[PDB]
Amino acid sequence: AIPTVTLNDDNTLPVVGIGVGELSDSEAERSVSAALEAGYRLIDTAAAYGNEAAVGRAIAASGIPRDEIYVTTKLATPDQGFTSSQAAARASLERLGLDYVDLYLIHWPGGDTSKYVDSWGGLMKVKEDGIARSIGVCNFGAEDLETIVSLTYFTPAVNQIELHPLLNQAALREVNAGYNIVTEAYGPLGVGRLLDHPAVTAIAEAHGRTAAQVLLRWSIQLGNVVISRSANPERIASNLDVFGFELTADEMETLNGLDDGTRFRPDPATYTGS
Ligand SMILES: Nc1ncnc2c1ncn2[C@@H]1O[C@H](COP(=O)(O)OP(=O)(O)OC[C@H]2OC[C@H](O)[C@@H]2O)[C@@H](O)[C@H]1OP(=O)(O)O
């Protein structure tokens, strides 16, 4: 019953998915299996997390037709390059045990414009070859976006960015929308630190819902595709259950008022890792 968004290349994605981040092989397989059983279809991993094969095993064992599942993975920063990115996409497929992925992203700008531009050209070939249905970016700022769009005339389908009430990304969301790029929010609970924020708990108590439900619903109402995570099968199911209520404009405004620039994940302006 999950709503979808339509991308600029005519493909569609669910508005909520599960990301595994740096979970160990065993934990990654466990959470993806639980998510699929609960009804998640958008699954997000990365080569840099080292757990692609584990995710692939959860998918293989699920008994769900491949066509119904939306798999995202990412180009690790050390693998950037025109030729190297095409090889890295194919290596990711081998690890995942898949013939294609649905979304393939540059993981970080990585602090070298030549290299991320070349990586983008590589990704365009990856898409042309049918290796990835859609291509996009993660943690790109407005200047990085202008650079790839200016030089290649090919616009990312998605820009996956850290986003939560302490870092609401209003400015970058507006840039994304102007280019017809979908915003994918990650880290929506702020490593769980936001679950006890008093503004969040007041709104949860007002609705008879949980803090986590409030944080995820707020992000959905901004128009984002929302990537969440839990290692617990019941909480995973609870994180999908965010279509039974709506936050009011007053409550949206309160949560929109909390931005203070807090990043729990690295800053892409500086970060040169993956
Ligand atoms: N429903 C619910 N209720 C109570 N506690 C919960 C719930 N869901 C998750 N959690 C907990 O919140 C904490 C934050 O987890 P995290 O995966 O970093 O979450 P983020 O949102 O910061 O980032 C997720 C990102 O990791 C990678 C990917 O990019 C994701 O966007 C963690 O201790 C979880 O414990 P638990 O025991 O696992 O449930």
What is the Å distance from ligand 1's center to 116 Cα?
30
Closest ligand 1 atom number to CA of residue 185? 31
- Residue among 26, 44, 189, 265 whose CB has most ligand 1 atoms within 8 A, to mutate: 189
The domain locations on the chain are 1-274
Cα 191 from Cα 162, distance rounded (Å): 11
Cα 189 from Cα 228, distance rounded (Å): 8
8 A C-beta contact, residue 70 and residue 14: yes
Cα angle value 239/243/248 (rounded, 5°): 110
* Residue showing tokens 């609970």: 189
φ/ψ (deg, to 5) at 12:
-125, 150
Residue 74 CA: distances (Å) to CA of 167, 175, 248, 251: 23, 22, 35, 34
Closest ligand 1 atom number to CA of residue 190? 22
What is the Å distance from ligand 1's center to 228 Cα?
7
Amino acid at site 50: G
8 A C-beta contact, residue 215 and residue 226: no
What is the Å distance from ligand 1's center to 226 Cα?
12
Sign of the dihedral defined by the CA atoms of residues 254, 159, 264, 34, in that order:
positive
Q: What is the DSSP pairing of strand 225-228 with strand 16-19?
A: parallel
Residue 141 CA: distances (Å) to CA of 162, 175, 229, 232: 11, 9, 24, 33
Beta bridge partners of 19: 44
φ/ψ (deg, to 5) at 70:
-115, 105
3-state secondary structure of 191: coil
3-state secondary structure of 102: strand
Residue 117 CA: distances (Å) to CA of 19, 145, 152: 26, 10, 8
Query: Catalytic: 49?
Result: yes
Question: Active-site residue among 49, 70, 104, 186?
Answer: 49
* Residue showing tokens 């339509």: 6
Right CATH for 1-274 from 3.20.20.80, 3.20.20.100, 3.65.10.10, 3.30.300.90: 3.20.20.100
Cα 96 from Cα 212, distance rounded (Å): 30
Cα 87 from Cα 137, distance rounded (Å): 18
3-state secondary structure of 149: helix
Amino acid at site 55: V
What is the chain's length? 274
- Residue among 191, 201, 236 whose CB has most ligand 1 atoms within 8 A, to mutate: 191
Cα 129 from Cα 142, distance rounded (Å): 28
Cα 219 from Cα 142, distance rounded (Å): 20
Query: Please, where are the H alpha helices in 72-112?
Result: 82-96
Question: Which of 23, 138, 128 is CA-nearest to residue 76?
Answer: 138
* Residue showing tokens 């920063």: 77
Residue 193 CA: distances (Å) to CA of 135, 166, 168, 215: 31, 11, 15, 11
Ligand 1 cavity residues, CB under 6 Å? 19, 21, 186-192, 195, 212, 227-232, 235, 238-239
3-state secondary structure of 49: helix
Measured in angstroms, the resolution is 1.6
What is the Å distance from ligand 1's center to 239 Cα?
9
Question: Which of 107, 117, 177 is CA-nearest to residue 152?
Answer: 117
| Burial of residue 43 (number of CB atoms within 10 Å: 0-12, 13-18, 19+) | buried
Our separate counts of H helices and E strands in the chain read 10, 10
Query: Please, where are the H alpha helices in 48-112?
Result: 52-61, 82-96
